[PDB]
Design an enzyme around this catalytic site. Structure first.
Site, PDB file in Angstrom:
ATOM      1  N   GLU B 106      -9.436   1.149   5.152  1.00  0.00           N
ATOM      2  CA  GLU B 106      -9.239   0.069   4.199  1.00  0.00           C
ATOM      3  C   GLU B 106     -10.388  -0.028   3.184  1.00  0.00           C
ATOM      4  O   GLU B 106     -10.163  -0.338   2.014  1.00  0.00           O
ATOM      5  CB  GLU B 106      -9.022  -1.260   4.957  1.00  0.00           C
ATOM      6  CG  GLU B 106      -7.647  -1.277   5.729  1.00  0.00           C
ATOM      7  CD  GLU B 106      -7.420  -2.536   6.575  1.00  0.00           C
ATOM      8  OE1 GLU B 106      -6.221  -2.883   6.790  1.00  0.00           O
ATOM      9  OE2 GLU B 106      -8.420  -3.164   7.069  1.00  0.00           O
ATOM     10  N   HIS B 109      -9.508   2.510   0.658  1.00  0.00           N
ATOM     11  CA  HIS B 109      -8.431   1.960  -0.228  1.00  0.00           C
ATOM     12  C   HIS B 109      -9.058   1.086  -1.291  1.00  0.00           C
ATOM     13  O   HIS B 109      -8.735   1.196  -2.452  1.00  0.00           O
ATOM     14  CB  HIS B 109      -7.406   1.065   0.589  1.00  0.00           C
ATOM     15  CG  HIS B 109      -6.617   1.811   1.619  1.00  0.00           C
ATOM     16  ND1 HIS B 109      -5.687   1.201   2.429  1.00  0.00           N
ATOM     17  CD2 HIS B 109      -6.609   3.125   1.958  1.00  0.00           C
ATOM     18  CE1 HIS B 109      -5.161   2.095   3.242  1.00  0.00           C
ATOM     19  NE2 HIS B 109      -5.708   3.272   2.980  1.00  0.00           N
ATOM     20  N   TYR B 113      -9.156   1.577  -5.426  1.00  0.00           N
ATOM     21  CA  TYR B 113      -8.772   0.586  -6.422  1.00  0.00           C
ATOM     22  C   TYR B 113      -9.933   0.301  -7.436  1.00  0.00           C
ATOM     23  O   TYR B 113      -9.692   0.154  -8.651  1.00  0.00           O
ATOM     24  CB  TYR B 113      -8.244  -0.702  -5.743  1.00  0.00           C
ATOM     25  CG  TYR B 113      -6.921  -0.493  -4.987  1.00  0.00           C
ATOM     26  CD1 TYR B 113      -5.801  -0.003  -5.640  1.00  0.00           C
ATOM     27  CD2 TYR B 113      -6.810  -0.813  -3.621  1.00  0.00           C
ATOM     28  CE1 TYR B 113      -4.628   0.204  -4.982  1.00  0.00           C
ATOM     29  CE2 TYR B 113      -5.637  -0.654  -2.943  1.00  0.00           C
ATOM     30  CZ  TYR B 113      -4.533  -0.136  -3.620  1.00  0.00           C
ATOM     31  OH  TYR B 113      -3.343   0.071  -2.946  1.00  0.00           O
ATOM     32  N   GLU B 168       0.354  -5.955   6.541  1.00  0.00           N
ATOM     33  CA  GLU B 168       0.520  -4.549   6.264  1.00  0.00           C
ATOM     34  C   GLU B 168       1.904  -4.173   5.844  1.00  0.00           C
ATOM     35  O   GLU B 168       2.062  -3.262   5.064  1.00  0.00           O
ATOM     36  CB  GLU B 168       0.166  -3.720   7.460  1.00  0.00           C
ATOM     37  CG  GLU B 168      -1.154  -3.093   7.321  1.00  0.00           C
ATOM     38  CD  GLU B 168      -2.075  -3.676   8.269  1.00  0.00           C
ATOM     39  OE1 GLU B 168      -3.288  -3.437   8.147  1.00  0.00           O
ATOM     40  OE2 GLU B 168      -1.568  -4.359   9.189  1.00  0.00           O
ATOM     41  N   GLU B 202      -0.838   2.118   5.267  1.00  0.00           N
ATOM     42  CA  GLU B 202      -0.238   0.769   5.598  1.00  0.00           C
ATOM     43  C   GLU B 202       1.028   0.834   6.495  1.00  0.00           C
ATOM     44  O   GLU B 202       1.187   0.015   7.383  1.00  0.00           O
ATOM     45  CB  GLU B 202       0.098  -0.014   4.306  1.00  0.00           C
ATOM     46  CG  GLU B 202      -1.043  -0.122   3.304  1.00  0.00           C
ATOM     47  CD  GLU B 202      -2.209  -0.907   3.856  1.00  0.00           C
ATOM     48  OE1 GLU B 202      -3.119  -0.295   4.452  1.00  0.00           O
ATOM     49  OE2 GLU B 202      -2.200  -2.162   3.753  1.00  0.00           O
ATOM     50  N   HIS B 205      -0.425   1.464   9.894  1.00  0.00           N
ATOM     51  CA  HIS B 205      -1.008   0.211  10.334  1.00  0.00           C
ATOM     52  C   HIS B 205       0.072  -0.790  10.787  1.00  0.00           C
ATOM     53  O   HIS B 205      -0.083  -1.421  11.764  1.00  0.00           O
ATOM     54  CB  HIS B 205      -1.911  -0.387   9.235  1.00  0.00           C
ATOM     55  CG  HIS B 205      -3.047   0.513   8.831  1.00  0.00           C
ATOM     56  ND1 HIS B 205      -3.833   0.276   7.721  1.00  0.00           N
ATOM     57  CD2 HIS B 205      -3.509   1.663   9.375  1.00  0.00           C
ATOM     58  CE1 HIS B 205      -4.738   1.229   7.606  1.00  0.00           C
ATOM     59  NE2 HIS B 205      -4.577   2.077   8.607  1.00  0.00           N
TER      60      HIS B 205
HETATM   61 FE   LIG Z   1      -3.771  -1.597   6.213  1.00  0.00          FE
END
Ligand SMILES: [Fe+3]
Ligand SMILES: [Fe+3]
Lengths: 279, 288
Positions: B106, B109, B113, B168, B202, B205
């Site tokens: 995460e 991630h 971004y 998620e 995701e 997850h």
């Molecule tokens: Fe996630």
């Protein structure tokens, strides 16, 4: 030291809403290096080390060093520093570090599963380990130095010792087996694990150098000197040293302790050189 | 909260919430399916270093103003709109490993971004204004009320884990889909490529939380599971094609709600509940 709660790296970064621009390029480089060094237990080929594991004094030394690695530490500190350091570059490194310690722990478990096929032997080994004079000494030192009572600076320095001083004799022991060309998955994962542990060490030395309010020389030396005694107490004492010289190993431990001091910006206190040109 | 107070009073002695006292090493593996998830995650490891945006910037400059505004707001929502808490609450070693890995992923991630936003919104002042602007939109405030209700230190673990599955599974489902809309146009490769990597993470997850929920002896009443999920859909509908209208851009708002309802039904049945929406996936490009 605690009354200095105005430290910038311990202060919330309200002024920043995204990662870029990088505010701490040097702590960010360490994160990028850990990320690029990522390895899994899957890279350890074990089959040709069980034939290789199968002398009786060596067998005994190994089982005990693996059991130590797997069971020596009591009750998380990458997670503490993740919570209390506030700069994003540092949060990222500590969070990646928790997942790498987990790969370390899994790799030791896997090694243990291969070397000690008998669940009864293994449980007996874990109980007899969990009482050693070196396991008790470590817990005294952590009790003393990793308090919520302690300053962040004492905690960061203690962290530097858990990474750079504790276990360095067992890492060395396994490097001695590599010098001999024996036990190839053990020595291979050992050199990866040891590589990660060195990055983790320099990183805490870096965090400590971002602090405006550093410890007195004397206090740093106390923490380190004590971690030395904890470490002295295992790899040639609680577990006797099988083609290695106990005294030369003390010197190597002291040599890594001085090197950490230099790194933390203190005078050497032992003045030991590295006895082993193989390390 | 009658159905919640009875749930906690029962989770006193859940296996997966109880210290592993008689375990001392990872092998032998005691939870092989939880383990399998961890190994899949770890085999999926990727870093933002693999994302390049040079092609994207050429594309972005060709885009019309509506599409640029849409992309900037979606990114800013992703950037700024608790695996660490589940790490500590579940007591089994295989799940702890998964959760700790999830934090690092995460973080990747998030960095991705940040990288997208640094390239798409080179002006530090407009970035600043974008972020200040989104902190206020109803959709973020809707997000926070749902989260304050369903994820607190007061809840039952079972509630929190179904909420976590919605976080998620359902939240961001619309923005993931909208980015795939751009892939379909053969545009913005960095954006869409990192989108499929992150979307796939995701998914993993989401399924793992469904597995964890299945490991609980004491299940929530289906009615509680459905309320969590309906409320999350409402949170997700309030942003994509409502706070950030997509029709002007060529997308379809009405099919967007239908697609979010599809994703939610797929979550419920993964959580062992009956579907309640019966919406089918309107988009042939969204599993293909
Ligand atoms: Fe996630
Ligand atoms: Fe470490």
């Amino acid at each position: 030291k605690s009354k200095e709660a105005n430290e910038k790296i311990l202060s919330k970064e309200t002024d920043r809403f995204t990662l870029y621009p990088i505010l701490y390029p040097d702590v960010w480089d360490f994160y990028k290096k850990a990320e690029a060094s990522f390895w899994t237990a899957e890279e350890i080929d074990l089959s040709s080390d069980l034939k290789d594991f199968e002398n009786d004094n060596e067998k005994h030394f190994i089982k005990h060093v693996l059991a130590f690695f797997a069971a020596s530490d009591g009750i998380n500190l990458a997670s503490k520093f993740l919570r209390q350091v506030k700069i994003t570059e540092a949060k990222k490194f500590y969070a990646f570090q928790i997942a790498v310690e987990n790969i370390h722990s899994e790799t030791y478990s896997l090694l243990i599963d291969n070397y000690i096929k008998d669940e009864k032997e293994r449980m007996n080994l874990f109980h007899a380990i969990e009482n050693i004079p070196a396991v008790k000494n470590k817990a005294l030192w952590a009790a003393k130095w990793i308090n919520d009572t302690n300053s962040f600076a004492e905690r960061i320095v203690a962290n530097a010792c858990v990474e750079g001083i504790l276990f360095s004799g067992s890492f060395c022991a396994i490097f001695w087996f590599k010098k001999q060309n024996k036990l190839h998955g053990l020595t291979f994962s050992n050199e990866l694990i040891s590589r990660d542990e060195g990055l983790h060490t320099d990183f805490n030395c870096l965090i400590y150098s971002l602090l405006e309010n550093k410890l007195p020389e004397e206090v740093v030396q106390n923490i380190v000197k004590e971690a030395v005694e904890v470490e002295r107490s295992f790899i040639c004492e609680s577990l006797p040293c099988i083609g290695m010289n106990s005294r030369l190993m003390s010197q190597y431990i002291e040599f890594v302790a001085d090197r950490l001091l230099e790194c933390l910006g203190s005078p050497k206190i032992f003045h030991a050189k590295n006895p082993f040109n193989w390390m």
